[PDB]
């Protein structure tokens, strides 16, 4: 419903964790830490279906462009993932709205805030972030790569079997000389 302002509350909670640190980011992306906490605060990572590691895996999968952070589109794509982890078997819409229902409205803090005062953030060398002078996203929002380039998911093999062993000074799997 409404291809733009779909859920609202979910988008609000996204901002809550997105602007965690920098309020000028608006709410375009989210890093692995804030995303990990997002699941924790909303207890989407229940441990029985979705564990901490699995949450980091999803984040490491959907991103694609290396990226310390994922954009809103890939966030709602990640939600579909965790949704199918728990609410699978039901209606696609219900599963998606359900997982969002467990998140929407809350902020990065289970009643009490997380005491983290100890990490030296005094590294203000001006070069750090810098805003005006470093770099901003170039206009490539219209023409992006469908599946990055070659789709690229997993190239996992049985373990590379060599005839009667030996082969070439033992199993030199892409060992420098190839």
Coordinates of N, CA and C in Angstrom, one line a residue, residues 57-132:
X57 N 25.8 -12.2 8.9 CA 25.8 -12.9 7.6 C 24.9 -12.2 6.6
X58 N 23.6 -12.0 7.0 CA 22.6 -11.3 6.2 C 23.1 -10.0 5.8
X59 N 23.6 -9.2 6.8 CA 24.2 -7.9 6.5 C 25.3 -7.9 5.5
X60 N 26.2 -8.9 5.7 CA 27.4 -9.1 4.8 C 27.0 -9.6 3.4
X61 N 25.8 -10.2 3.3 CA 25.3 -10.7 2.0 C 24.6 -9.6 1.2
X62 N 23.6 -9.0 1.8 CA 22.8 -8.0 1.1 C 23.6 -6.8 0.6
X63 N 24.6 -6.4 1.3 CA 25.4 -5.2 1.0 C 25.9 -5.2 -0.5
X64 N 26.6 -6.2 -0.8 CA 27.2 -6.4 -2.2 C 28.5 -5.5 -2.4
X65 N 28.3 -4.1 -2.4 CA 29.3 -3.2 -2.7 C 30.4 -3.0 -1.6
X66 N 30.9 -4.1 -1.1 CA 31.8 -4.0 0.1 C 31.2 -3.3 1.3
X67 N 31.1 -2.0 1.2 CA 30.3 -1.2 2.1 C 30.3 -1.5 3.6
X68 N 30.7 -0.6 4.4 CA 30.6 -0.7 5.9 C 29.1 -0.7 6.3
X69 N 28.2 -0.2 5.4 CA 26.8 0.1 5.7 C 25.9 -0.4 4.5
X70 N 24.6 -0.6 4.8 CA 23.7 -1.0 3.8 C 22.6 0.1 3.7
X71 N 22.1 0.3 2.4 CA 21.0 1.3 2.2 C 19.6 0.8 2.5
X72 N 18.7 1.7 2.8 CA 17.3 1.3 3.1 C 16.7 0.2 2.3
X73 N 16.9 0.2 1.0 CA 16.4 -0.8 0.1 C 17.0 -2.2 0.5
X74 N 18.2 -2.3 0.8 CA 18.9 -3.5 1.2 C 18.5 -3.9 2.7
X75 N 18.1 -2.9 3.4 CA 17.6 -3.1 4.8 C 16.3 -3.8 4.8
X76 N 15.4 -3.3 4.0 CA 14.1 -4.0 3.8 C 14.2 -5.3 3.1
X77 N 15.3 -5.5 2.3 CA 15.6 -6.8 1.7 C 16.1 -7.8 2.8
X78 N 16.9 -7.2 3.7 CA 17.4 -8.0 4.8 C 16.3 -8.4 5.7
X79 N 15.3 -7.5 5.9 CA 14.1 -7.8 6.7 C 13.3 -9.0 6.1
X80 N 13.2 -9.1 4.8 CA 12.6 -10.2 4.1 C 13.3 -11.5 4.4
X81 N 14.6 -11.5 4.5 CA 15.5 -12.6 4.9 C 15.1 -13.1 6.3
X82 N 15.2 -12.2 7.3 CA 14.9 -12.6 8.7 C 13.4 -13.0 8.8
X83 N 12.6 -12.4 8.0 CA 11.1 -12.7 8.0 C 10.9 -14.2 7.6
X84 N 11.6 -14.6 6.5 CA 11.5 -15.9 6.0 C 12.2 -17.0 6.9
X85 N 13.1 -16.4 7.7 CA 13.7 -17.3 8.8 C 12.7 -17.7 9.8
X86 N 11.8 -16.8 10.2 CA 10.9 -17.1 11.3 C 9.4 -17.3 10.8
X87 N 8.9 -16.3 10.0 CA 7.5 -16.3 9.6 C 7.2 -17.0 8.3
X88 N 8.1 -18.0 7.9 CA 7.9 -18.7 6.7 C 6.7 -19.6 6.7
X89 N 6.1 -19.8 5.5 CA 4.9 -20.7 5.4 C 3.6 -19.9 5.4
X90 N 3.6 -18.7 5.9 CA 2.5 -17.8 5.9 C 2.5 -16.9 4.6
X91 N 1.6 -16.0 4.5 CA 1.5 -15.0 3.4 C 2.7 -14.1 3.4
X92 N 3.3 -13.9 2.2 CA 4.5 -13.0 2.1 C 4.3 -11.7 2.7
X93 N 3.2 -11.0 2.5 CA 2.9 -9.7 3.1 C 2.8 -9.8 4.6
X94 N 2.1 -10.8 5.1 CA 1.9 -11.0 6.6 C 3.3 -11.2 7.3
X95 N 4.1 -12.1 6.7 CA 5.5 -12.3 7.3 C 6.3 -11.0 7.3
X96 N 6.3 -10.2 6.3 CA 7.0 -9.0 6.2 C 6.5 -7.9 7.2
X97 N 5.2 -7.7 7.1 CA 4.6 -6.8 8.1 C 4.7 -7.2 9.5
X98 N 4.8 -8.5 9.8 CA 4.9 -9.1 11.1 C 6.3 -8.7 11.7
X99 N 7.4 -9.1 11.0 CA 8.7 -8.8 11.5 C 8.9 -7.3 11.7
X100 N 8.4 -6.5 10.8 CA 8.4 -5.0 11.0 C 7.6 -4.6 12.2
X101 N 6.5 -5.3 12.4 CA 5.7 -5.0 13.6 C 6.4 -5.2 14.9
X102 N 7.4 -6.1 14.9 CA 8.3 -6.4 16.1 C 9.3 -5.3 16.3
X103 N 9.5 -4.5 15.3 CA 10.6 -3.4 15.3 C 10.0 -2.0 15.4
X104 N 9.1 -1.7 14.5 CA 8.5 -0.3 14.3 C 8.2 0.4 15.6
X105 N 8.7 1.6 15.8 CA 8.4 2.4 17.0 C 9.5 2.6 18.0
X106 N 10.3 1.6 18.2 CA 11.3 1.5 19.2 C 12.6 2.3 18.8
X107 N 13.5 2.5 19.8 CA 14.7 3.2 19.6 C 15.9 2.4 20.2
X108 N 17.2 2.8 19.8 CA 18.4 2.0 20.2 C 18.7 2.1 21.8
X109 N 17.8 1.4 22.6 CA 18.0 1.4 24.0 C 16.8 0.6 24.7
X110 N 17.2 -0.5 25.3 CA 16.2 -1.3 26.1 C 15.9 -0.7 27.5
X111 N 15.1 0.4 27.5 CA 14.8 1.2 28.7 C 16.1 2.0 29.1
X112 N 17.1 1.3 29.5 CA 18.4 1.9 29.8 C 19.3 2.0 28.6
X113 N 20.1 3.1 28.6 CA 21.0 3.3 27.4 C 22.3 2.5 27.6
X114 N 23.0 2.2 26.5 CA 24.3 1.4 26.6 C 25.5 2.3 26.9
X115 N 26.0 2.1 28.2 CA 27.3 2.8 28.6 C 28.5 2.4 27.7
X116 N 29.0 3.3 26.9 CA 30.1 3.0 26.0 C 31.2 4.0 26.1
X117 N 31.1 4.9 27.1 CA 32.2 6.0 27.2 C 33.5 5.4 27.6
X118 N 34.4 5.2 26.6 CA 35.7 4.7 26.8 C 36.5 4.6 25.4
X119 N 35.7 4.5 24.4 CA 36.3 4.5 23.0 C 36.8 5.9 22.6
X120 N 38.1 6.1 22.5 CA 38.7 7.4 22.1 C 38.1 7.9 20.8
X121 N 37.3 8.9 20.8 CA 36.7 9.5 19.6 C 37.4 10.9 19.4
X122 N 38.5 11.1 20.0 CA 39.2 12.4 19.9 C 40.2 12.5 18.7
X123 N 40.0 11.6 17.7 CA 40.8 11.5 16.5 C 40.5 12.6 15.5
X124 N 40.0 13.7 16.0 CA 39.6 14.8 15.1 C 40.8 15.4 14.3
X125 N 41.2 14.8 13.2 CA 42.3 15.2 12.4 C 41.9 16.1 11.2
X126 N 40.6 16.4 11.2 CA 39.9 17.2 10.1 C 39.7 16.3 8.9
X127 N 40.8 15.6 8.5 CA 40.7 14.6 7.4 C 39.6 13.6 7.7
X128 N 39.4 13.2 9.0 CA 38.4 12.2 9.4 C 37.0 12.7 9.1
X129 N 36.3 12.0 8.2 CA 35.0 12.3 7.6 C 35.1 13.6 6.8
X130 N 35.4 14.7 7.5 CA 35.7 16.0 6.8 C 34.4 16.7 6.2
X131 N 33.5 15.8 5.8 CA 32.3 16.3 5.1 C 32.6 17.1 3.8
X132 N 32.8 18.4 4.0 CA 33.2 19.3 2.9 C 34.6 19.1 2.5

